[PDB]
mmCIF file of C-alpha atoms (C1' of nucleotides) in Angstrom:
data_model
loop_
_atom_site.group_PDB
_atom_site.id
_atom_site.type_symbol
_atom_site.label_atom_id
_atom_site.label_comp_id
_atom_site.label_asym_id
_atom_site.label_seq_id
_atom_site.Cartn_x
_atom_site.Cartn_y
_atom_site.Cartn_z
ATOM 1 C CA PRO A 1 0.000 0.000 0.000
ATOM 2 C CA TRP A 2 1.053 3.565 -0.792
ATOM 3 C CA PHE A 3 0.492 5.927 2.144
ATOM 4 C CA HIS A 4 0.604 9.665 1.439
ATOM 5 C CA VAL A 5 0.810 12.030 4.401
ATOM 6 C CA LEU A 6 -1.724 14.854 4.119
ATOM 7 C CA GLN A 7 -0.361 18.289 4.999
ATOM 8 C CA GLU A 8 -2.212 20.893 7.039
ATOM 9 C CA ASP A 9 -4.115 22.689 4.267
ATOM 10 C CA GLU A 10 -5.634 19.536 2.760
ATOM 11 C CA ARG A 11 -6.475 18.368 6.294
ATOM 12 C CA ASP A 12 -8.962 21.134 7.064
ATOM 13 C CA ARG A 13 -9.844 21.241 3.357
ATOM 14 C CA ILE A 14 -11.386 17.769 3.717
ATOM 15 C CA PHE A 15 -11.769 17.462 7.506
ATOM 16 C CA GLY A 16 -12.779 19.759 10.350
ATOM 17 C CA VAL A 17 -10.866 22.002 12.725
ATOM 18 C CA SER A 18 -9.725 18.888 14.616
ATOM 19 C CA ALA A 19 -7.293 18.351 11.712
ATOM 20 C CA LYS A 20 -5.232 21.403 12.738
ATOM 21 C CA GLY A 21 -2.766 19.771 15.125
ATOM 22 C CA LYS A 22 -3.884 16.181 14.557
ATOM 23 C CA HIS A 23 -2.305 14.590 11.493
ATOM 24 C CA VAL A 24 -4.203 12.891 8.667
ATOM 25 C CA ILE A 25 -2.827 10.257 6.287
ATOM 26 C CA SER A 26 -4.178 8.674 3.117
ATOM 27 C CA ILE A 27 -4.267 5.106 1.812
ATOM 28 C CA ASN A 28 -3.771 4.622 -1.921
ATOM 29 C CA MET A 29 -4.005 1.435 -3.983
ATOM 30 C CA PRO A 30 -2.760 0.480 -7.438
ATOM 31 C CA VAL A 31 -5.304 -0.121 -10.178
ATOM 32 C CA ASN A 32 -4.235 -3.786 -10.170
ATOM 33 C CA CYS A 33 -5.483 -3.981 -6.581
ATOM 34 C CA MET A 34 -9.246 -4.281 -6.149
ATOM 35 C CA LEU A 35 -9.523 -0.730 -4.788
ATOM 36 C CA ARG A 36 -8.922 2.009 -7.348
ATOM 37 C CA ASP A 37 -10.000 4.693 -4.845
ATOM 38 C CA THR A 38 -8.263 6.268 -1.864
ATOM 39 C CA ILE A 39 -8.873 5.666 1.845
ATOM 40 C CA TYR A 40 -8.521 8.418 4.450
ATOM 41 C CA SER A 41 -7.661 8.296 8.143
ATOM 42 C CA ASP A 42 -9.048 9.674 11.371
ATOM 43 C CA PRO A 43 -7.500 13.048 12.316
ATOM 44 C CA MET A 44 -5.133 12.090 15.114
ATOM 45 C CA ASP A 45 -1.798 13.346 16.337
ATOM 46 C CA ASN A 46 1.010 10.780 15.966
ATOM 47 C CA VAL A 47 1.672 9.001 12.676
ATOM 48 C CA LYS A 48 2.673 5.779 14.459
ATOM 49 C CA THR A 49 -0.889 5.080 15.615
ATOM 50 C "C1'" G B 1 11.061 -29.748 -12.381
ATOM 51 C "C1'" A B 2 5.903 -29.306 -11.012
ATOM 52 C "C1'" G B 3 1.457 -31.534 -7.138
ATOM 53 C "C1'" A B 4 1.845 -32.585 -1.804
ATOM 54 C "C1'" C B 5 4.371 -33.838 2.602
ATOM 55 C "C1'" U B 6 9.699 -33.963 5.754
ATOM 56 C "C1'" U B 7 13.910 -31.202 6.997
ATOM 57 C "C1'" G B 8 17.134 -27.503 5.689
ATOM 58 C "C1'" G B 9 18.892 -23.417 2.915
ATOM 59 C "C1'" G B 10 18.309 -18.587 0.059
ATOM 60 C "C1'" C B 11 15.683 -14.124 -0.812
ATOM 61 C "C1'" A B 12 11.870 -10.614 0.250
ATOM 62 C "C1'" A B 13 7.910 -8.094 2.595
ATOM 63 C "C1'" U B 14 5.729 -6.236 6.927
ATOM 64 C "C1'" G B 15 5.232 -5.846 12.010
ATOM 65 C "C1'" U B 16 6.730 -6.134 17.051
ATOM 66 C "C1'" G B 17 10.233 -5.200 21.675
ATOM 67 C "C1'" A B 18 14.699 -2.585 23.454
ATOM 68 C "C1'" C B 19 19.042 0.790 23.264
ATOM 69 C "C1'" U B 20 22.754 5.197 22.112
ATOM 70 C "C1'" G B 21 23.367 9.776 20.238
ATOM 71 C "C1'" C B 22 21.398 13.755 17.092
ATOM 72 C "C1'" U B 23 18.248 17.757 16.423
ATOM 73 C "C1'" G B 24 12.887 20.254 16.364
ATOM 74 C "C1'" A B 25 8.847 23.084 18.614
ATOM 75 C "C1'" U B 26 6.608 25.219 22.744
ATOM 76 C "C1'" C B 27 6.648 27.113 27.991
ATOM 77 C "C1'" A B 28 8.401 28.683 32.503
ATOM 78 C "C1'" G B 29 12.518 30.426 35.631
ATOM 79 C "C1'" C B 30 17.591 33.315 35.942
ATOM 80 C "C1'" A B 31 21.863 36.518 34.799
ATOM 81 C "C1'" G B 32 24.579 40.176 32.076
ATOM 82 C "C1'" U B 33 25.493 44.092 28.519
ATOM 83 C "C1'" C B 34 24.106 48.228 25.526
ATOM 84 C "C1'" A B 35 20.777 52.101 24.551
ATOM 85 C "C1'" C B 36 16.805 55.491 25.222
ATOM 86 C "C1'" A B 37 13.647 58.522 28.484
ATOM 87 C "C1'" U B 38 12.590 61.894 33.252
ATOM 88 C "C1'" U B 39 14.347 65.783 36.037
ATOM 89 C "C1'" G B 40 18.150 67.453 38.956
ATOM 90 C "C1'" C B 41 23.449 68.106 40.831
ATOM 91 C "C1'" C B 42 26.650 69.979 37.292
ATOM 92 C "C1'" C B 43 31.294 72.299 35.331
ATOM 93 C "C1'" A B 44 33.190 73.239 30.441
ATOM 94 C "C1'" A B 45 32.187 76.161 26.166
ATOM 95 C "C1'" G B 46 30.345 80.016 22.647
ATOM 96 C "C1'" U B 47 26.650 83.493 21.573
ATOM 97 C "C1'" C B 48 23.533 87.280 23.454
ATOM 98 C "C1'" U B 49 21.347 90.670 27.060
ATOM 99 C "C1'" C B 50 22.067 93.096 31.575
ATOM 100 C "C1'" U B 51 26.083 94.144 34.036
ATOM 101 C "C1'" U B 52 30.331 92.863 36.472
ATOM 102 C "C1'" G C 1 29.185 87.505 37.012
ATOM 103 C "C1'" A C 2 23.378 87.221 36.611
ATOM 104 C "C1'" G C 3 20.163 85.552 32.856
ATOM 105 C "C1'" A C 4 18.856 83.835 27.902
ATOM 106 C "C1'" C C 5 20.721 80.420 24.534
ATOM 107 C "C1'" U C 6 23.768 76.396 22.889
ATOM 108 C "C1'" U C 7 27.313 72.835 22.675
ATOM 109 C "C1'" G C 8 31.092 69.372 26.353
ATOM 110 C "C1'" G C 9 30.809 65.931 30.300
ATOM 111 C "C1'" G C 10 29.949 63.136 34.446
ATOM 112 C "C1'" C C 11 26.785 62.334 38.424
ATOM 113 C "C1'" A C 12 21.775 61.559 40.845
ATOM 114 C "C1'" A C 13 17.326 58.740 41.609
ATOM 115 C "C1'" U C 14 13.795 56.517 38.503
ATOM 116 C "C1'" G C 15 11.574 54.710 34.109
ATOM 117 C "C1'" U C 16 11.334 51.920 29.671
ATOM 118 C "C1'" G C 17 13.632 49.699 25.472
ATOM 119 C "C1'" A C 18 16.900 46.101 22.566
ATOM 120 C "C1'" C C 19 20.663 41.707 22.754
ATOM 121 C "C1'" U C 20 23.248 37.547 24.460
ATOM 122 C "C1'" G C 21 24.027 33.764 27.786
ATOM 123 C "C1'" C C 22 22.257 30.223 31.904
ATOM 124 C "C1'" U C 23 19.325 26.340 34.129
ATOM 125 C "C1'" G C 24 14.485 23.571 33.750
ATOM 126 C "C1'" A C 25 9.858 20.965 31.340
ATOM 127 C "C1'" U C 26 6.735 18.720 27.732
ATOM 128 C "C1'" C C 27 5.775 17.071 22.948
ATOM 129 C "C1'" A C 28 7.566 15.691 18.221
ATOM 130 C "C1'" G C 29 11.200 14.050 14.904
ATOM 131 C "C1'" C C 30 16.220 11.703 12.908
ATOM 132 C "C1'" A C 31 20.343 8.420 12.213
ATOM 133 C "C1'" G C 32 22.030 4.099 14.117
ATOM 134 C "C1'" U C 33 22.053 -1.007 16.838
ATOM 135 C "C1'" C C 34 20.415 -5.425 18.948
ATOM 136 C "C1'" A C 35 16.325 -9.004 19.916
ATOM 137 C "C1'" C C 36 11.554 -11.608 18.248
ATOM 138 C "C1'" A C 37 7.036 -12.703 14.615
ATOM 139 C "C1'" U C 38 4.121 -13.582 10.511
ATOM 140 C "C1'" U C 39 3.432 -13.678 5.314
ATOM 141 C "C1'" G C 40 5.214 -14.594 0.410
ATOM 142 C "C1'" C C 41 8.882 -16.403 -3.074
ATOM 143 C "C1'" C C 42 12.879 -19.667 -4.469
ATOM 144 C "C1'" C C 43 16.036 -24.055 -3.971
ATOM 145 C "C1'" A C 44 17.919 -28.684 -2.071
ATOM 146 C "C1'" A C 45 17.139 -33.502 -0.750
ATOM 147 C "C1'" G C 46 13.618 -37.283 2.215
ATOM 148 C "C1'" U C 47 8.393 -39.459 0.298
ATOM 149 C "C1'" C C 48 5.176 -40.266 -3.916
ATOM 150 C "C1'" U C 49 2.486 -38.337 -8.123
ATOM 151 C "C1'" C C 50 2.813 -35.883 -12.898
ATOM 152 C "C1'" U C 51 6.225 -34.993 -17.088
ATOM 153 C "C1'" U C 52 11.375 -35.084 -20.405
#
RNA sequence: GAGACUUGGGCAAUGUGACUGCUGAUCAGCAGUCACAUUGCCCAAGUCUCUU
RNA sequence: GAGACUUGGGCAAUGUGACUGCUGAUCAGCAGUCACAUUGCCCAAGUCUCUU
């Protein structure tokens, strides 16, 4: 899986004010994989969790 | 070689636990220096007025 | 000399400004290093099947 970290502007562009200090990441699949769409994460602080 | 099992070897992926340094951001607490401002003590110094 | 006026300078208490350094906390992040797990691939032979 290809994970793309979402910077601050896209965070509150797609999510609420909670995405200010709490990071958001994305999940991206190849077309060969069943999913051809992206998956987004819960706005939350540390990337590890 | 393949199908499967037995053991071993090779590679890879991903995750987990621990350690040593390295910086980042924010916040509190402390010291020192320099400068400006207020008025006064204030003498120097020139000008000017009075006058010495 | 008195006074006006100005430059020269320290001193006086007091005010504010700018800079560096010092200890202390939290969070995040980096580069290393060891230890364990699963998954997948490959190969070897043990066993047999299939095929050259």
